[PDB]
Amino acid sequence: TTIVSVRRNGQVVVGGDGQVSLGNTVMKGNARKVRRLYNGKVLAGFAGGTADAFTLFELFERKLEMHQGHLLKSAVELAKDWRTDRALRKLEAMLIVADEKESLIITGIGDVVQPEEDQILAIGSGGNYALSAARALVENTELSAHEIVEKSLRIAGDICVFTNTNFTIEELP
């Protein structure tokens, strides 16, 4: 799995592959690993255990709902459930969430992290492959955030055996 997000020119994109693999064999190549939350105004992409990912996703959605859908605050409250005595079971998955304001990556262990400057996030086995292609594309091109995402995902896919070419790209106008 590969998920990457780029934010430039007042545009936010988050896309990912579609390959679902059981061991060293593929099961499905058309999975949607990026979806819209909170009245379709926040982008979310997940990686890791198929079940753990969905539960991390779902848990986060409940949060957005208990707040005015504020990405940051929500991320922080969800992560707080891991920073207590009640050892809330950990999930072997990761999420990339974004909207018109910020972009974050949240993990099933309980921590939130923000970009760096070029507003680029990437998770999954193929993450760092799309990450490089994107950093490169951003510091040397004028390509749209939507173009960078598709181009980097493809690259990543040609390197990682668990990342295919069936993308699902969501952008927030």
Partner: protein
């Protein structure tokens, strides 16, 4: 003999802003009290109330509507929080207590309670199956089970005598941000025929709640200060800033609906409320500038990165 649905809405319009759908729905319900009762023995008992489910955010009017309605119909009224019955251990912690409490608030008038009592079950979305942190879920499913008897029609014993719940009107509410009404149990779901939606309040609505309604906050403070011999007046611009500020903090921090207006006015009328006794004979003009000074600047921070890596 009694008001019509169009008349009732107008009576509610004097105290509530917006929420046309909810207003309309309760007017129909109140009018049906009058419709049956004009019927003959057979049907008069067979025809029952069509209870309501008001879905909508915090402080946007769901209770005021229910409360005002009972007021204009002089009907025994009662509000209770769904969750209050989570767990029980003694008589008073049982759902049946809703009827005793209602009968007690009307001085035992049994005919009154049965004919047109109204029960508002607040936050019914809380006794569903939401989130994974569901420790005692059997408990919540349980209170739904406990309400059934009441909403389906039964008799409860009060120190005033036996009282039937067959014709009491029931109004339930919720924001249902995580749960859906379809999550309630089938029996309850079928007994709450009507579902009305109430919307969030904008700044434009805030501005109207401030002055239009009978005994609005602006009218209250005018009369309060008049008591101390002070004459105050809010300009259109002033009202507009008070509403923007209120809508502003509900949006950046915790959203409490129209209650926020009370918080802001108090923060605004802070000074005059204290010095009113020393300003007799004077007249105070609360305009834009007065409001921008009183309501300082931006609530308080927005910190949160303290937990972020």
């Amino acid at each position: 003999s009694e008001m019509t649905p169009r008349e009732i809405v107008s009576e509610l319009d004097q105290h509530i802003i917006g929420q046309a759908d909810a207003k309309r729905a309760v007017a129909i319900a109140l009018r049906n009290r009058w419709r049956r009762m004009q019927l003959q023995e057979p049907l008069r008992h067979e025809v029952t109330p069509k209870n309501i489910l008001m879905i909508g955010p915090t402080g946007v009017g769901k209770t005021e509507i229910a409360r005002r309605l009972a007021k204009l119909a002089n009907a025994p009224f009662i509000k209770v929080e769904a969750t209050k019955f989570t767990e029980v251990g003694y008589v008073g912690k049982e759902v049946d207590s809703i009827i005793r409490d209602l009968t007690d608030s009307a001085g035992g008038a049994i005919d009154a309670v049965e004919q047109n009592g109204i029960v508002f079950i607040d936050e019914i979305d809380k006794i569903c199956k939401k989130g994974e942190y569901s420790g005692a879920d059997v408990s919540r499913e349980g209170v739904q089970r406990d309400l059934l008897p009441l909403v389906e029609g039964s008799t409860v014993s009060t120190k005033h005598g036996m009282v039937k719940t067959d014709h009491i009107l029931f109004i339930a509410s919720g924001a249902f941000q995580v749960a859906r009404p379809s999550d309630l149990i089938p029996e309850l779901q079928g007994r709450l025929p009507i579902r009305v939606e109430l919307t969030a309040l904008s700044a434009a609505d805030f501005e109207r709640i401030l002055t239009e309604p009978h005994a609005s906050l602006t009218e209250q403070y005018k009369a309060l200060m008049a008591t101390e011999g002070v004459n105050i007046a809010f300009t259109t611009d002033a009202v507009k800033k008070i509403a923007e500020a209120a809508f502003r903090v509900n949006e950046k921090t915790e959203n409490i609906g129209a209650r926020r207006l009370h918080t802001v006015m108090e923060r605004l009328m802070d000074k005059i409320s204290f010095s009113a006794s020393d300003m007799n004979g004077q007249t105070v003009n609360i305009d834009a500038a007065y409001v921008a000074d009183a309501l300082g600047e931006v609530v308080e921070n927005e910190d949160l990165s303290r937990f972020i890596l």
